[PDB]
Design a protein around this nucleic acid. Structure first.
Ligand SMILES: [K+]
Ligand SMILES: [K+]
Ligand SMILES: [K+]
Ligand SMILES: [K+]
Ligand SMILES: [K+]
Ligand SMILES: [K+]
Ligand SMILES: [K+]
Ligand SMILES: [K+]
Ligand SMILES: [K+]
Ligand SMILES: [K+]
Ligand SMILES: [K+]
Ligand SMILES: [K+]
Ligand SMILES: [K+]
Ligand SMILES: [K+]
Ligand SMILES: [K+]
Ligand SMILES: [K+]
Ligand SMILES: [K+]
Ligand SMILES: [K+]
Ligand SMILES: [K+]
Ligand SMILES: [K+]
Ligand SMILES: [K+]
Ligand SMILES: [K+]
Ligand SMILES: [K+]
Ligand SMILES: [K+]
Ligand SMILES: [K+]
Ligand SMILES: [K+]
Ligand SMILES: [K+]
Ligand SMILES: [K+]
Ligand SMILES: [Mg+2]
Ligand SMILES: [Mg+2]
Ligand SMILES: [Mg+2]
Ligand SMILES: [Mg+2]
Ligand SMILES: [Mg+2]
Ligand SMILES: [Mg+2]
Ligand SMILES: [Mg+2]
Ligand SMILES: [Mg+2]
Ligand SMILES: [Mg+2]
Ligand SMILES: [Mg+2]
Ligand SMILES: [Mg+2]
Ligand SMILES: [Mg+2]
Ligand SMILES: [Mg+2]
Ligand SMILES: [Mg+2]
Ligand SMILES: [Mg+2]
Ligand SMILES: [Mg+2]
Ligand SMILES: [Mg+2]
Ligand SMILES: [Mg+2]
Ligand SMILES: [Mg+2]
Ligand SMILES: [Mg+2]
Ligand SMILES: [Mg+2]
Ligand SMILES: [Mg+2]
Ligand SMILES: [Mg+2]
Ligand SMILES: [Mg+2]
Ligand SMILES: [Mg+2]
Ligand SMILES: [Mg+2]
Ligand SMILES: [Mg+2]
Ligand SMILES: [Mg+2]
Ligand SMILES: [Mg+2]
Ligand SMILES: [Mg+2]
Ligand SMILES: [Mg+2]
Ligand SMILES: [Mg+2]
Ligand SMILES: [Mg+2]
Ligand SMILES: [Mg+2]
Lengths: 274, 85
RNA sequence: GGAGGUAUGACAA
RNA sequence: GCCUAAGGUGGGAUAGAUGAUUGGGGUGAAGUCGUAACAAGGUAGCCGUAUCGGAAGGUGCGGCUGGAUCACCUCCU
RNA sequence: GGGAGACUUGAGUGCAGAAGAGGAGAGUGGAAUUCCAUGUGUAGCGGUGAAAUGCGUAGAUAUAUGGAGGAACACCAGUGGCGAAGGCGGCUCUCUGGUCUGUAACUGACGCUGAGGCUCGAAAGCGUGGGGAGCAAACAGGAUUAGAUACCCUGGUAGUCCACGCCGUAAACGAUGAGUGCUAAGUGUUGGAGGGUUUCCGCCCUUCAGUGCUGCAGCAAACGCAUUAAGCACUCCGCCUGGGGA
RNA sequence: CUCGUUAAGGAACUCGGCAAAAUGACCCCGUAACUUCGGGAGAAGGGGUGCUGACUUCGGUCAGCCGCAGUGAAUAGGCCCAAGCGACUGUUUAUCAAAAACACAGGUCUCUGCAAAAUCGUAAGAUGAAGUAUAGGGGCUGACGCCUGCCCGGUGCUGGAA
RNA sequence: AGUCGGGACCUAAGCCGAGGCCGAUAGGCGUAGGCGAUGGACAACAGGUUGAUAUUCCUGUACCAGUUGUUUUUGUUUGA
RNA sequence: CCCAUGUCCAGGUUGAAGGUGCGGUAAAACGCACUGGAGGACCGAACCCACGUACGUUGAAAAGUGCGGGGAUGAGGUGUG
């Protein structure tokens, strides 16, 4: 659940966090840890390409098994662990053959569940099946767009998609955004919804906490200089003073769509949203 | 459950064949109360059932008060056996 | 026969 | 030397008077605006609540008959 | 009144039965509305006291096949049932409260009321997150009008729905606190029980608990109430003391 | 220039109590409005402090002694009432501006179905992200509380397609 | 200076980069593979001595890696 | 500004969540103690900073010094690469 801190200090005032009740341990799997460096929004040229990123706490990457292509044997859920890299929690699972892996933790997952993957797996939270085998109306997550590539869609905490129907070699899906689109029927998905639904409700509370989470301050364009931002300049506070608000590089910032107009995936997107 | 009820009645019977008596009634009420407390925690919004639970609690309280007034030693024995206050 | 449901107009005289 | 009245200092508590200004309320034989209610009062009224409107008030939801007229059902005579 | 006993009628338990939209949770079915898609098809549709706004040749309305999604559960349905009250109506399952009737095995007055407290509490409203078909405050436009910040018409947001949490008020009404006993009848109806018949169905008699109607005694200012009292009595509680100001 | 003292007065100085003065440690008593119930608060306002005996439950207490004065020197908050602005801790013009400016947690709008959008780059290749709509980018507002009215004609954006 | 710090050890960020990708030229990018400590690994201390060095020289007492040789055990292809 | 890897923050103060005990109740909520040790928490050296003022202004100094001043477990300081 969400615990609210008493307003002992102005910084702590109105702050909330998770109790981490679901988390069963704090010792990740050594075999599955990998090193990660904080790119801080800088590409191979060393230029800042994405603003407002950098600093914050050190992290280790946990190798998640998005593919769920090990259908031979059952995987027993050993622990539910905190993952610094993603909003959702992960689950360490042991395959009966001794292979250890991490998966996303679906809502309602519990230690001891014996998950299975493959066409014949039953429709139970945490199981993985090709979309063709998942009955309509089912709630799923960790959907892959191409067979064997591994789950890409519906992975954030609390997210979920629903199977609407079949057609041809494609399966009709409503994604978490409300967009309805076709996805290749041989793509896999995990039954259920991503756990840690409460994540959205956390109140960060103070600037230092965002800095921990690797967000650097965001400076409004209206308080820059004209050579810095189209909104920059002007005496005193100023209105936008343009036809429409724009990003630092002149791209309109309200309502202007950016999806490529000749996207190949229009043929598969049935109903858009966002 | 009648079977559970009957076993409790035999356990707390003041004497052979004693269906009705402060001890038997209080013990049976206590088990119903515990079972119904679990139902209430499962169904927080079952207000109508909760009213019956309160009535059972009141009746059990009245029986305890009568028993204490009548034979304090039997009252002490019963509260110890049932783990009551 | 009965019963429950389906625009304005003082004041007193 | 202790005790201690009075006096001094201090922060509170409490009672009243007073105060630019302001709020609702009341009275005032013939002022202005409408006509909300009483008849089915001309959209039945009323209660709680919400919102809107110069004003009475309107509308929404729920509730009551302390509901006129009329057509059915069930009950009684 | 106290103390020591006894008792079973009140109260409760046991045992055997009865009914129910009682509550909570998870599912699920059909009609209808709206929207979406596609055929047919052409000039209206819709609406009023009468009109207009509006929708429609960018092909509407209608019509046929589908799809989506939301809310409410037609017929049954009945002064019918259930709940302390608010209230509860598709169906299924899970959990669960109460009530009623027998019986007389059990306890042996263990009961009634109940300030303060606690809990529950229509609708509207509020917070967080969802959902959003229809309806619809606010609001827009068309009307009506002297004016119309309304009634009428076309649209329409919050809300109505869900989860959790607040709120705590209603003509929350039978405008009638609870408990108990007693005081003519007649007649419906719900759930039982016993008997006398009846081949069974069913008819009759008795009886309990509801639920209506009519109506003596009695009560009342009158209207009226009248075994479901507002009659005759006892116990406890809440409440009233001219109107306004309030 | 740096420092010490200063009769009586005590802010009359001055743009302005600038500077200086004053407060300053520990222990005890005591402590308001307001409040988001955490604070406000070291509020305020007071009292004690040395040495020597006696007794102590070891912290005291009782008795006595000395001085103008006992944290005897040094090092240690001045306080209160009220208004504006900004919630707050932070950040800023290295070298005339530290602020009411920026940031901020929170709010909201909008883009983005993943070879995502965005950005660096001719490209390859990168960041975004070994992340996936409870995520990421952009615009505005800026804790919290109560709220956020009317206008879609014009300009943008979005949709439409005769 | 075998023992301290560095090299003959290891890797992070970053950098270079066979082939390779991309590109008017120049070149840009990058795989394998490398480089790169501020980190990991790693055997010696006490005293004395000079005008100037000392865990480096000297005295004492060690340790680490290895070579030769003597001796002692054990294995020689069902093989340590 | 950022990356990787080290390192620094005397000493005091306050007392969040949680936990235990005892009350309290049908069970609770709740109350009181104790425990516990949170914080862009408090006071204050080193450290970092640079608010006021005097002096300096061919300076001791091409930005400082004296007296005061703010932060001082963090959105912190700082070293190496
Ligand atoms: K805060
Ligand atoms: K996480
Ligand atoms: K900003
Ligand atoms: K400006
Ligand atoms: K009216
Ligand atoms: K039942
Ligand atoms: K709501
Ligand atoms: K009612
Ligand atoms: K009857
Ligand atoms: K009066
Ligand atoms: K003077
Ligand atoms: K103060
Ligand atoms: K003295
Ligand atoms: K001080
Ligand atoms: K500021
Ligand atoms: K701020
Ligand atoms: K403000
Ligand atoms: K400052
Ligand atoms: K600034
Ligand atoms: K605000
Ligand atoms: K934003
Ligand atoms: K703006
Ligand atoms: K923001
Ligand atoms: K406009
Ligand atoms: K426009
Ligand atoms: K060496
Ligand atoms: K080193
Ligand atoms: K200075
Ligand atoms: Mg950003
Ligand atoms: Mg500027
Ligand atoms: Mg420009
Ligand atoms: Mg401008
Ligand atoms: Mg201006
Ligand atoms: Mg009228
Ligand atoms: Mg009227
Ligand atoms: Mg009327
Ligand atoms: Mg209106
Ligand atoms: Mg409601
Ligand atoms: Mg309307
Ligand atoms: Mg009332
Ligand atoms: Mg009757
Ligand atoms: Mg003087
Ligand atoms: Mg003097
Ligand atoms: Mg002066
Ligand atoms: Mg002067
Ligand atoms: Mg000064
Ligand atoms: Mg001193
Ligand atoms: Mg500030
Ligand atoms: Mg500051
Ligand atoms: Mg400067
Ligand atoms: Mg300055
Ligand atoms: Mg601003
Ligand atoms: Mg070395
Ligand atoms: Mg290269
Ligand atoms: Mg080459
Ligand atoms: Mg070594
Ligand atoms: Mg030397
Ligand atoms: Mg601090
Ligand atoms: Mg330094
Ligand atoms: Mg600086
Ligand atoms: Mg401070
Ligand atoms: Mg400090």
């Amino acid at each position: 659940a969400i615990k609210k801190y008493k307003p002992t200090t102005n910084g702590r005032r109105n702050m909330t966090s998770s109790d981490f009740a679901e988390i069963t341990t704090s010792t990740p799997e050594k075999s599955l840890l990998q090193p990660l460096k904080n790119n801080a929004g800088r590409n191979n040229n060393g230029r800042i390409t994405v603003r407002h990123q950098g600093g914050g706490h050190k992290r280790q990457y946990r190798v998640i098994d998005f593919k769920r292509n090990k259908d031979n044997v059952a995987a027993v859920v050993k622990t539910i662990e905190y993952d610094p890299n993603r909003s959702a929690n992960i689950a360490l699972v042991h395959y009966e053959d001794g292979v250890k892996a991490y998966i996303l933790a679906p809502k309602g997952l519990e230690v001891g569940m014996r998950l299975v993957s493959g066409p014949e797996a039953d429709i139970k939270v945490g199981n993985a099946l090709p979309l063709e085998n998942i009955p309509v109306g089912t709630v799923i997550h960790n959907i892959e767009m191409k067979p064997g590539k591994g789950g890409q869609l519906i992975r954030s905490a609390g997210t979920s998609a629903q199977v609407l129907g079949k057609e041809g070699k494609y399966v009709l899906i409503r994604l978490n955004s409300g967009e309805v689109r076709m996805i290749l029927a041989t793509c896999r998905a995990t039954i259920g919804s991503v756990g840690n639904e409460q994540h959205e409700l956390i109140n960060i509370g103070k600037a230092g906490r965002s800095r921990w989470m690797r967000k650097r301050p965001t400076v409004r364009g209206s308080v820059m200089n004209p050579n810095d931002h189209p909104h920059g300049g002007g005496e005193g506070k100023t209105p936008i003073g343009r036809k429409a608000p724009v990003s630092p590089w002149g791209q309109p910032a309200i309502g202007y769509k950016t999806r490529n107009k000749k996207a190949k995936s229009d043929k598969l997107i049935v109903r858009r949203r966002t | 459950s009648q079977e559970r009820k009957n076993e409790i009645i035999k356990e707390y019977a003041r004497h052979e064949g004693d269906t009705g008596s402060p001890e038997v009634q209080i013990a049976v009420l206590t088990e119903d109360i515990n079972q119904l407390n679990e139902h209430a925690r499962t169904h927080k919004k079952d207000h109508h059932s909760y009213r019956g639970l309160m009535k059972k609690i009141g009746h059990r309280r009245n029986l305890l008060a009568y028993l204490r007034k009548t034979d304090i030693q039997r009252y002490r024995e019963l509260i110890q056996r049932l783990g009551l206050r």
